[PDB]
Amino acid sequence: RPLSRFWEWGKNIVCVGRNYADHVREMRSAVLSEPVLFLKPSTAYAPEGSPILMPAYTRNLHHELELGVVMGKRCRAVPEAAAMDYVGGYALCLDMTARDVQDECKKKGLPWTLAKSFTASCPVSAFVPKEKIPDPHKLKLWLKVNGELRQEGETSSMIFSIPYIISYVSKIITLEEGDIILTGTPKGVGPVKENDEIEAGIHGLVSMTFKVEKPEY
Amino acid sequence: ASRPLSRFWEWGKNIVCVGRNYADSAVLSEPVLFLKPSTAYAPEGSPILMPAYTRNLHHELELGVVMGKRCRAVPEAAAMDYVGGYALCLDMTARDVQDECKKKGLPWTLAKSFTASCPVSAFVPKEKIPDPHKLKLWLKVNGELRQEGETSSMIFSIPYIISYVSKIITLEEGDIILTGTPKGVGPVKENDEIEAGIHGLVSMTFKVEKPEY
Ligand SMILES: [Cl-]
Ligand SMILES: [Mg+2]
Ligand SMILES: [Mg+2]
Ligand SMILES: [Mg+2]
């Protein structure tokens, strides 16, 4: 029920591939191709207080800073123009990525599961109600690793609008209340190692902190 | 309100699927894994929905293992303790799309993970299946037998699959693992009727439809 704890009860996590233009020239072109989609299991969620867990099989774990859009009602094959009506709110997420594994998956034509969909691969902020974000395309996202800025992005740089992404996703996969869509990452993706501290936020709206750990199991 | 295992498709969060797991070499490789969203579930009474972007929708008859306890990095030797029961599933597959995904190194999502891509039987409690490697699975299309398989032919055991999966992805109560398909996969078209079962345990029937929305 309560969206303020959506990661406890939400079933599904859908993530887009590329959705940020580093330069206006990338709008002039990238729009001609649909967004790539992949899934994370509900057990990817790592709410604040829980660690980023480094999978045992990677030597190149990357952060990807992303705005997540939390669905407030069941959303099946909706038009772009109705999509915002299905949104409950937002959360800042990291699409944690085993980049070495991802390269292997791509090369061999394998699913991206071990690269993208492992336990604790979706660190997630507190929920932000949609009332606080009247325009999700006018947000500024930032991420630091051990105090150094690694990603900074404006959601005004998105290739596809959030309503378009919702619509497109909903035509392939029905979204349930409490499902989240991760809407892509600005430039600056890069690695983290054991004991690194990640701090990230949406300016004026939400702050989060995650420590990178190896599992104790 | 209630969340019995008998209705696990209503409340279960996650669906994990293995790639190849039936022996016609393969042992030398770990199992391939991909996900389906909870909205892939199509319980009996709901249609198999043809995605608009495929011209080659395949049935894949599979035994699903429904988890009964939260299962994180469990050893093969304890894996069966985390099972709640079973369900017969179809891993509905846009095979044309899958070929393109493999060639281009894309996720398998549009091929494997679409709305209604997991037709699912009634729940079978674990007590009724003391050995899930001694089952017979069958599938008919318009009354003609198209897949028949023995789960004794599995490459990887169910406990090994549970262990392996649980080391990558924690499984919650009500999550399901689809354990692969025997030979005979093939296409279906609009208005086809699919009947399938686990011999002596469960059967189901589904119509192939285009969405009315
Ligand atoms: Cl995938
Ligand atoms: Mg991403
Ligand atoms: Mg799920
Ligand atoms: Mg399959």
Side-chain angles (χ1 to χ4, degrees), chain A residues 37-39 110-113 117, chain B residues 33-35 106-109 113:
Chain A
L37 303 182
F38 59 90
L39 307 178
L110 296 171
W112 292 12
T113 310
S117 315
Chain B
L33 303 182
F34 60 89
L35 304 182
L106 297 169
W108 290 13
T109 311
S113 318

Side-chain angles (χ1 to χ4, degrees), chain A residues 15-18 38 40 64-66 94-97 99 116 182-185:
Chain A
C15 307
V16 306
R18 184 164 153 275
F38 59 90
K40 300 178 184 276
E64 301 202 340
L65 177 67
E66 312 204 9
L94 307 181
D95 173 20
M96 301 302 303
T97 302
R99 191 73 69 191
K116 287 288 201 178
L182 276 60
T183 59
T185 198

Side-chain angles (χ1 to χ4, degrees), chain A residues 8-9 11-12 36-39 41-43 76 106 109-113 117-119 172-174 176 217, chain B residues 10-11 13-14 32-34 37-39 72-73 102 105-109 113-115 164 168-170 172 213:
Chain A
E8 296 184 355
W9 56 267
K11 298 177 174 172
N12 309 298
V36 171
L37 303 182
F38 59 90
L39 307 178
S42 70
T43 54
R76 179 178 73 177
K106 287 159 73 172
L110 296 171
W112 292 12
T113 310
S117 315
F118 52 88
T119 304
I172 298 154
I173 296 168
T174 296
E176 300 284 6
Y217 56 81
Chain B
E10 297 183 354
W11 55 267
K13 299 183 178 169
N14 307 300
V32 170
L33 303 182
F34 60 89
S38 71
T39 54
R72 178 176 69 177
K102 287 164 153 184
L106 297 169
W108 290 13
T109 311
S113 318
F114 52 89
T115 304
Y164 180 79
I168 299 155
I169 297 168
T170 297
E172 302 285 7
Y213 55 80

